[PDB]
Coordinates of N, CA and C in Angstrom, one line a residue:
Chain A
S1 N 12.7 -12.5 20.6 CA 12.0 -13.1 21.8 C 10.6 -13.5 21.4
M2 N 9.7 -12.6 20.9 CA 8.4 -13.1 20.5 C 8.5 -13.8 19.2
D3 N 8.0 -15.1 19.2 CA 8.2 -15.9 18.0 C 7.3 -15.4 16.8
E4 N 7.7 -15.9 15.6 CA 7.0 -15.5 14.4 C 5.5 -15.8 14.3
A5 N 5.1 -16.9 15.0 CA 3.7 -17.3 15.0 C 2.8 -16.2 15.7
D6 N 3.3 -15.7 16.8 CA 2.6 -14.7 17.5 C 2.7 -13.3 16.8
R7 N 3.8 -13.1 16.1 CA 4.0 -11.8 15.4 C 3.0 -11.8 14.2
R8 N 3.0 -13.0 13.5 CA 2.2 -13.1 12.4 C 0.7 -13.0 12.8
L9 N 0.4 -13.6 13.9 CA -1.0 -13.6 14.5 C -1.5 -12.2 14.8
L10 N -0.6 -11.4 15.3 CA -0.9 -10.0 15.6 C -1.1 -9.2 14.4
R11 N -0.4 -9.6 13.3 CA -0.5 -8.9 12.0 C -1.8 -9.3 11.3
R12 N -2.1 -10.6 11.1 CA -3.3 -11.0 10.4 C -4.6 -10.6 11.2
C13 N -4.4 -10.4 12.5 CA -5.6 -9.9 13.4 C -5.6 -8.4 13.6
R14 N -4.8 -7.7 12.8 CA -4.7 -6.2 13.0 C -6.1 -5.5 13.0
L15 N -6.9 -5.7 12.1 CA -8.2 -5.0 12.0 C -9.2 -5.3 13.2
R16 N -9.3 -6.6 13.5 CA -10.2 -7.1 14.6 C -9.8 -6.4 15.8
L17 N -8.5 -6.4 16.1 CA -7.8 -5.8 17.2 C -8.0 -4.3 17.3
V18 N -7.6 -3.5 16.3 CA -7.7 -2.1 16.4 C -9.2 -1.7 16.3
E19 N -10.1 -2.6 15.9 CA -11.5 -2.2 15.9 C -12.2 -2.5 17.3
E20 N -11.7 -3.6 17.9 CA -12.3 -4.0 19.2 C -11.6 -3.6 20.5
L21 N -10.3 -3.4 20.5 CA -9.6 -3.1 21.8 C -10.1 -1.9 22.6
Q22 N -10.3 -2.1 23.9 CA -10.7 -1.1 24.8 C -9.5 -0.9 25.7
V23 N -8.8 0.2 25.5 CA -7.6 0.5 26.3 C -7.7 1.3 27.6
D24 N -8.7 2.0 27.8 CA -9.0 2.8 29.0 C -8.7 2.1 30.3
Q25 N -9.2 0.9 30.5 CA -9.0 0.1 31.7 C -7.8 -0.8 31.6
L26 N -7.1 -0.9 30.5 CA -5.9 -1.8 30.4 C -4.6 -1.2 30.9
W27 N -4.4 0.1 30.8 CA -3.2 0.8 31.3 C -2.6 0.2 32.6
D28 N -3.4 0.2 33.6 CA -3.0 -0.4 34.9 C -2.7 -1.9 34.9
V29 N -3.3 -2.6 34.1 CA -3.0 -4.0 34.0 C -1.8 -4.3 33.3
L30 N -1.5 -3.5 32.2 CA -0.3 -3.7 31.4 C 0.9 -3.3 32.3
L31 N 0.7 -2.4 33.2 CA 1.7 -1.9 34.2 C 1.9 -3.0 35.3
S32 N 0.7 -3.4 35.9 CA 0.7 -4.3 37.0 C 1.2 -5.7 36.6
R33 N 1.1 -6.1 35.3 CA 1.7 -7.3 34.9 C 3.0 -7.2 34.3
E34 N 3.5 -5.9 34.2 CA 4.8 -5.7 33.6 C 4.9 -6.1 32.2
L35 N 3.8 -5.9 31.4 CA 3.9 -6.3 30.0 C 4.6 -5.2 29.3
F36 N 4.3 -3.9 29.7 CA 5.0 -2.7 29.2 C 5.6 -1.9 30.3
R37 N 6.6 -1.1 30.0 CA 7.2 -0.3 31.1 C 6.5 1.1 31.1
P38 N 6.4 1.7 32.2 CA 5.7 3.0 32.4 C 5.9 4.1 31.3
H39 N 7.1 4.2 30.7 CA 7.3 5.2 29.7 C 6.7 4.8 28.3
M40 N 6.7 3.5 28.0 CA 6.1 3.0 26.8 C 4.6 3.1 26.9
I41 N 4.0 2.9 28.1 CA 2.6 3.0 28.3 C 2.1 4.4 27.9
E42 N 2.9 5.4 28.3 CA 2.5 6.8 28.0 C 2.7 7.1 26.5
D43 N 3.7 6.4 25.9 CA 4.0 6.6 24.5 C 2.7 6.1 23.7
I44 N 2.2 5.0 24.1 CA 1.0 4.4 23.5 C -0.2 5.3 23.7
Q45 N -0.4 5.8 24.9 CA -1.6 6.6 25.2 C -1.5 7.9 24.4
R46 N -0.3 8.3 24.0 CA -0.1 9.6 23.2 C 0.1 9.4 21.7
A47 N -0.1 8.1 21.3 CA 0.0 7.7 19.9 C -1.0 8.4 19.0
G48 N -0.5 9.0 17.9 CA -1.3 9.6 16.9 C -2.1 10.8 17.6
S49 N -3.4 10.7 17.3 CA -4.4 11.7 17.8 C -4.8 11.3 19.3
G50 N -4.3 10.2 19.7 CA -4.6 9.7 21.1 C -6.0 9.1 21.1
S51 N -6.5 8.8 19.9 CA -7.8 8.2 19.8 C -7.7 6.7 20.2
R52 N -8.8 6.1 20.7 CA -8.8 4.8 21.1 C -8.1 3.8 20.1
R53 N -8.4 4.1 18.8 CA -7.8 3.3 17.7 C -6.3 3.4 17.6
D54 N -5.9 4.7 17.6 CA -4.5 4.9 17.5 C -3.7 4.4 18.7
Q55 N -4.3 4.4 19.8 CA -3.7 3.9 21.0 C -3.6 2.4 20.9
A56 N -4.7 1.8 20.5 CA -4.8 0.4 20.3 C -3.9 -0.2 19.3
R57 N -3.7 0.6 18.2 CA -2.8 0.2 17.1 C -1.3 0.3 17.6
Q58 N -0.9 1.3 18.3 CA 0.4 1.4 18.8 C 0.7 0.4 19.9
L59 N -0.3 0.0 20.7 CA -0.2 -1.0 21.7 C 0.2 -2.4 21.0
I60 N -0.6 -2.8 20.0 CA -0.3 -4.1 19.4 C 1.0 -4.1 18.6
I61 N 1.4 -3.0 18.1 CA 2.7 -2.9 17.4 C 3.9 -3.1 18.4
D62 N 3.8 -2.4 19.5 CA 4.8 -2.4 20.5 C 4.9 -3.8 21.2
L63 N 3.8 -4.5 21.1 CA 3.6 -5.8 21.7 C 4.7 -6.8 21.1
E64 N 5.0 -6.7 19.8 CA 5.9 -7.5 19.2 C 7.3 -7.5 19.9
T65 N 7.6 -6.4 20.5 CA 8.9 -6.2 21.1 C 9.0 -6.6 22.6
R66 N 7.9 -7.2 23.2 CA 7.9 -7.5 24.6 C 8.2 -9.0 25.0
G67 N 8.9 -9.7 24.1 CA 9.3 -11.1 24.5 C 8.3 -12.2 24.2
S68 N 8.7 -13.4 24.4 CA 7.9 -14.6 24.2 C 6.6 -14.7 24.9
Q69 N 6.5 -14.1 26.1 CA 5.2 -14.1 26.9 C 4.4 -12.9 26.6
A70 N 4.8 -12.1 25.7 CA 4.0 -10.9 25.4 C 2.5 -11.2 25.1
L71 N 2.3 -12.2 24.2 CA 0.9 -12.5 23.8 C 0.1 -13.1 25.0
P72 N 0.5 -14.2 25.6 CA -0.3 -14.8 26.7 C -0.4 -13.8 27.8
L73 N 0.5 -12.9 28.0 CA 0.5 -11.9 29.1 C -0.6 -10.8 28.7
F74 N -0.6 -10.5 27.4 CA -1.5 -9.6 26.8 C -2.9 -10.1 27.0
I75 N -3.1 -11.4 26.7 CA -4.3 -12.1 26.9 C -4.8 -12.1 28.3
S76 N -3.9 -12.2 29.2 CA -4.3 -12.1 30.6 C -4.8 -10.7 31.0
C77 N -4.2 -9.7 30.4 CA -4.7 -8.3 30.7 C -6.0 -8.1 30.1
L78 N -6.3 -8.7 28.9 CA -7.6 -8.6 28.3 C -8.6 -9.2 29.2
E79 N -8.4 -10.4 29.6 CA -9.3 -11.1 30.5 C -9.6 -10.3 31.8
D80 N -8.6 -9.8 32.5 CA -8.9 -9.1 33.7 C -9.6 -7.8 33.5
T81 N -9.7 -7.4 32.2 CA -10.4 -6.2 31.8 C -11.8 -6.6 31.4
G82 N -12.1 -7.9 31.3 CA -13.4 -8.3 30.9 C -13.6 -8.4 29.4
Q83 N -12.5 -8.3 28.6 CA -12.6 -8.4 27.2 C -12.5 -9.9 26.7
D84 N -13.5 -10.6 27.1 CA -13.5 -12.1 26.9 C -13.6 -12.6 25.5
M85 N -14.3 -12.0 24.6 CA -14.4 -12.4 23.2 C -13.1 -12.2 22.5
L86 N -12.5 -11.1 22.7 CA -11.2 -10.7 22.1 C -10.1 -11.7 22.7
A87 N -10.1 -11.9 24.0 CA -9.2 -12.9 24.6 C -9.4 -14.3 24.1
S88 N -10.7 -14.6 23.9 CA -11.1 -16.0 23.4 C -10.6 -16.2 22.0
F89 N -10.8 -15.2 21.2 CA -10.4 -15.4 19.8 C -8.9 -15.6 19.7
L90 N -8.1 -14.8 20.4 CA -6.7 -14.9 20.4 C -6.2 -16.2 21.0
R91 N -6.8 -16.7 22.1 CA -6.5 -18.0 22.7 C -6.7 -19.1 21.7
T92 N -7.9 -19.1 21.1 CA -8.2 -20.2 20.2 C -7.2 -20.3 19.1
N93 N -6.8 -19.1 18.6 CA -5.8 -19.1 17.5 C -4.4 -19.6 17.9
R94 N -3.9 -19.2 19.1 CA -2.6 -19.7 19.6 C -2.7 -21.2 20.0
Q95 N -3.9 -21.6 20.5 CA -4.1 -22.9 20.9 C -4.3 -23.9 19.7
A96 N -4.6 -23.3 18.6 CA -4.8 -24.1 17.4 C -3.4 -24.6 16.9
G97 N -2.8 -25.4 17.7 CA -1.5 -25.9 17.4 C -1.3 -27.2 18.1
Chain B
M1 N 4.4 -5.6 -10.1 CA 3.0 -5.9 -10.5 C 2.8 -5.7 -12.0
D2 N 1.6 -6.0 -12.5 CA 1.2 -5.8 -13.9 C 1.6 -4.4 -14.3
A3 N 1.8 -4.2 -15.6 CA 2.1 -2.9 -16.2 C 0.9 -2.0 -16.1
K4 N -0.2 -2.4 -16.4 CA -1.4 -1.6 -16.3 C -1.7 -1.2 -14.9
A5 N -1.4 -2.1 -14.0 CA -1.6 -1.9 -12.5 C -0.7 -0.8 -12.1
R6 N 0.6 -1.0 -12.2 CA 1.7 -0.1 -11.8 C 1.4 1.3 -12.4
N7 N 1.0 1.3 -13.7 CA 0.7 2.6 -14.4 C -0.6 3.3 -13.9
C8 N -1.6 2.5 -13.5 CA -2.8 3.0 -13.1 C -2.5 3.8 -11.8
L9 N -1.7 3.2 -11.0 CA -1.2 3.8 -9.7 C -0.6 5.1 -10.0
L10 N 0.5 5.1 -10.8 CA 1.2 6.3 -11.2 C 0.3 7.4 -11.8
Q11 N -0.7 7.0 -12.6 CA -1.6 7.9 -13.2 C -2.5 8.6 -12.2
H12 N -2.7 8.0 -11.1 CA -3.6 8.6 -10.1 C -2.9 8.8 -8.7
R13 N -1.6 8.5 -8.6 CA -0.9 8.6 -7.3 C -1.0 10.1 -6.8
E14 N -1.2 11.1 -7.6 CA -1.2 12.4 -7.1 C -2.6 12.7 -6.4
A15 N -3.7 12.3 -7.1 CA -5.0 12.5 -6.5 C -5.1 11.7 -5.2
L16 N -4.5 10.6 -5.2 CA -4.5 9.7 -4.0 C -3.9 10.4 -2.8
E17 N -2.6 10.8 -3.0 CA -1.8 11.5 -2.0 C -2.5 12.7 -1.4
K18 N -3.2 13.4 -2.3 CA -3.9 14.6 -1.9 C -5.2 14.3 -1.1
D19 N -5.6 13.1 -0.9 CA -6.8 12.8 -0.2 C -6.8 11.7 0.9
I20 N -6.1 10.6 0.6 CA -6.1 9.4 1.5 C -5.3 9.5 2.8
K21 N -5.9 8.9 3.8 CA -5.3 8.8 5.1 C -4.8 7.4 5.2
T22 N -3.5 7.2 5.4 CA -2.8 6.0 5.5 C -3.0 5.0 6.7
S23 N -3.3 5.4 7.9 CA -3.5 4.5 9.0 C -4.5 3.4 8.8
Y24 N -5.7 3.7 8.4 CA -6.8 2.7 8.2 C -6.4 1.8 7.1
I25 N -5.8 2.3 6.0 CA -5.4 1.6 4.9 C -4.3 0.6 5.2
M26 N -3.4 1.0 6.1 CA -2.3 0.2 6.5 C -2.8 -0.9 7.4
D27 N -3.8 -0.6 8.2 CA -4.4 -1.7 9.1 C -4.9 -2.8 8.2
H28 N -5.6 -2.5 7.1 CA -6.1 -3.5 6.2 C -5.0 -4.2 5.5
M29 N -4.0 -3.5 4.9 CA -2.9 -4.2 4.2 C -2.0 -5.0 5.1
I30 N -2.0 -4.6 6.4 CA -1.2 -5.4 7.4 C -2.0 -6.7 7.6
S31 N -3.3 -6.5 7.8 CA -4.1 -7.7 8.1 C -4.0 -8.6 6.9
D32 N -4.1 -8.1 5.7 CA -4.0 -8.9 4.4 C -2.7 -9.5 4.3
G33 N -1.7 -9.0 5.0 CA -0.3 -9.5 4.9 C 0.4 -9.0 3.7
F34 N 0.0 -7.8 3.2 CA 0.7 -7.1 2.1 C 1.5 -5.9 2.5
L35 N 1.7 -5.7 3.8 CA 2.5 -4.6 4.3 C 3.1 -5.1 5.6
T36 N 4.3 -4.7 5.8 CA 5.0 -5.1 7.0 C 5.0 -4.0 8.1
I37 N 5.3 -4.3 9.3 CA 5.4 -3.3 10.4 C 6.4 -2.3 10.2
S38 N 7.6 -2.7 9.7 CA 8.7 -1.7 9.4 C 8.2 -0.8 8.3
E39 N 7.7 -1.3 7.2 CA 7.2 -0.5 6.1 C 6.2 0.5 6.7
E40 N 5.3 -0.1 7.6 CA 4.3 0.8 8.2 C 4.8 1.9 9.0
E41 N 5.9 1.7 9.8 CA 6.5 2.8 10.5 C 7.2 3.8 9.7
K42 N 7.8 3.4 8.5 CA 8.5 4.3 7.6 C 7.4 5.3 7.1
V43 N 6.3 4.8 6.7 CA 5.2 5.6 6.2 C 4.6 6.5 7.3
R44 N 4.4 6.0 8.5 CA 3.8 6.7 9.6 C 4.8 7.8 10.0
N45 N 6.1 7.5 9.9 CA 7.1 8.5 10.4 C 7.2 9.8 9.5
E46 N 6.6 9.7 8.3 CA 6.6 10.9 7.4 C 5.9 12.1 8.1
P47 N 6.5 13.3 7.9 CA 6.0 14.6 8.5 C 4.6 15.0 8.1
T48 N 4.2 14.7 6.9 CA 2.8 15.1 6.5 C 2.1 13.9 5.8
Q49 N 0.8 13.9 5.8 CA 0.0 12.8 5.3 C 0.2 12.6 3.8
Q50 N 0.6 13.7 3.1 CA 0.8 13.6 1.6 C 2.1 12.8 1.4
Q51 N 3.0 12.9 2.3 CA 4.3 12.1 2.2 C 4.1 10.7 2.7
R52 N 3.2 10.5 3.6 CA 2.9 9.2 4.1 C 2.2 8.4 3.0
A53 N 1.2 9.0 2.4 CA 0.5 8.5 1.2 C 1.5 8.2 0.2
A54 N 2.4 9.2 -0.1 CA 3.4 9.1 -1.1 C 4.3 7.9 -0.8
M55 N 4.7 7.7 0.4 CA 5.6 6.6 0.8 C 4.9 5.3 0.6
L56 N 3.6 5.2 1.0 CA 2.8 4.0 0.9 C 2.8 3.5 -0.5
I57 N 2.3 4.5 -1.4 CA 2.2 4.3 -2.8 C 3.5 3.9 -3.4
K58 N 4.6 4.6 -2.9 CA 5.9 4.3 -3.4 C 6.2 2.8 -3.2
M59 N 5.8 2.3 -2.0 CA 6.1 0.9 -1.6 C 5.2 0.0 -2.4
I60 N 3.9 0.2 -2.5 CA 3.0 -0.6 -3.2 C 3.4 -0.8 -4.6
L61 N 4.0 0.2 -5.3 CA 4.4 0.2 -6.7 C 5.4 -1.0 -6.9
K62 N 6.2 -1.3 -5.9 CA 7.2 -2.4 -6.1 C 6.7 -3.7 -5.6
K63 N 5.4 -3.7 -5.3 CA 4.7 -5.0 -4.8 C 4.0 -5.8 -5.8
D64 N 3.5 -7.0 -5.4 CA 2.8 -7.9 -6.3 C 1.4 -7.4 -6.6
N65 N 0.8 -8.1 -7.5 CA -0.6 -7.8 -8.0 C -1.6 -7.8 -6.8
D66 N -1.4 -8.8 -5.9 CA -2.4 -8.9 -4.8 C -2.4 -7.6 -3.9
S67 N -1.2 -6.9 -3.8 CA -1.1 -5.7 -3.0 C -1.9 -4.6 -3.7
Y68 N -2.0 -4.6 -5.0 CA -2.8 -3.6 -5.7 C -4.2 -3.8 -5.4
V69 N -4.7 -5.1 -5.3 CA -6.1 -5.3 -5.0 C -6.4 -5.1 -3.5
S70 N -5.4 -5.3 -2.6 CA -5.5 -5.1 -1.2 C -5.7 -3.6 -0.9
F71 N -4.9 -2.8 -1.6 CA -5.0 -1.3 -1.5 C -6.3 -0.8 -2.1
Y72 N -6.8 -1.4 -3.2 CA -8.0 -1.0 -3.8 C -9.2 -1.4 -2.9
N73 N -9.2 -2.6 -2.3 CA -10.3 -3.0 -1.4 C -10.3 -2.1 -0.2
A74 N -9.1 -1.7 0.3 CA -9.0 -0.9 1.5 C -9.6 0.5 1.3
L75 N -9.3 1.1 0.1 CA -9.9 2.4 -0.3 C -11.4 2.4 -0.3
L76 N -11.9 1.3 -0.9 CA -13.4 1.1 -1.0 C -13.9 1.0 0.4
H77 N -13.4 0.0 1.2 CA -13.8 -0.2 2.6 C -13.7 1.0 3.5
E78 N -12.8 1.9 3.1 CA -12.6 3.1 3.9 C -13.3 4.4 3.4
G79 N -14.1 4.2 2.4 CA -14.9 5.4 1.9 C -14.3 6.2 0.7
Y80 N -13.1 5.8 0.2 CA -12.5 6.5 -0.9 C -13.0 5.9 -2.2
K81 N -14.3 6.0 -2.3 CA -15.0 5.4 -3.5 C -14.5 5.9 -4.8
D82 N -14.5 7.3 -5.0 CA -14.0 7.9 -6.3 C -12.6 7.5 -6.7
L83 N -11.7 7.4 -5.7 CA -10.3 7.0 -6.0 C -10.2 5.5 -6.3
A84 N -11.0 4.7 -5.7 CA -11.1 3.3 -6.0 C -11.6 3.1 -7.4
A85 N -12.5 4.0 -7.8 CA -13.1 3.9 -9.1 C -12.0 4.2 -10.1
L86 N -11.2 5.2 -9.9 CA -10.1 5.5 -10.8 C -9.1 4.4 -11.0
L87 N -9.0 3.6 -9.9 CA -8.0 2.5 -10.0 C -8.7 1.2 -10.5
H88 N -10.0 1.2 -10.7 CA -10.7 0.0 -11.2 C -10.1 -0.4 -12.5
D89 N -9.6 0.5 -13.3 CA -9.0 0.3 -14.6 C -7.7 -0.7 -14.5
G90 N -6.9 -0.4 -13.4 CA -5.7 -1.2 -13.2 C -5.6 -2.7 -12.9
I91 N -6.7 -3.3 -12.6 CA -6.8 -4.8 -12.3 C -8.0 -5.3 -11.4
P92 N -8.7 -4.3 -10.8 CA -9.4 -4.7 -9.5 C -10.2 -6.0 -9.6
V93 N -9.9 -6.8 -8.6 CA -10.4 -8.2 -8.3 C -10.9 -8.0 -6.9
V94 N -11.8 -8.8 -6.4 CA -12.3 -8.7 -5.0 C -12.9 -7.3 -4.9
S95 N -13.4 -6.9 -3.8 CA -14.0 -5.6 -3.6 C -14.4 -5.3 -2.1

C-alpha cells in the first residue's frame, strides 16, 4: 500500500524525525483521522522505555504499514498539532516530484 | 567488506556488545540507508542489549565497507568515543 518513495523517505529522514517528533498531542489526531487504530496507538505509546523518542521511532516504523495515504495523513496530523517545520520538510520532499 | 574492516569488527565485537546501545545507532544506519526496518526489528526483538548489539554486529559483518563507516560515525556521534577509536584501525573514513 505505502509506496517505496514514501517508505524510503521515512527511512532517510529517520534521525530528523525521531529527534523532532512531539507525540503527546498527536495521539488524538492519529485516532481522529484514523491513521492508526486504537490498539496500535497504545503499542506506540508503550514502545521501549516509553520515552518521547522511542514512541516517535515506533510511530514512524508502523507508519509504513498504514497504506498509500499514510504519509499525507501523517502530515495532516503534524500540522493540526502545530508541528509546521516538520510538516513542511516532509511536504517539500514528497512534492519534489 | 574489507578484510581489515571485518577483522577489526571481530577483534572488538565483544567490547562493543558489552557497552553499546543499538537504538540510536540503528537510527543513524537507517537514515544512512545501511540498515533495513526488518533488520532493525530482528535486532530490537532480542531479549538483552548484548544480543541486540551482537545481532547488529552480526549483520554489519556481512555488509559493505560503507556500513562499517556508518557504524563508526554512529558510535562517535553517539558518544562511544573509545570504541570508535578501537575501530579506527579497520578503515574509518568520514567522522
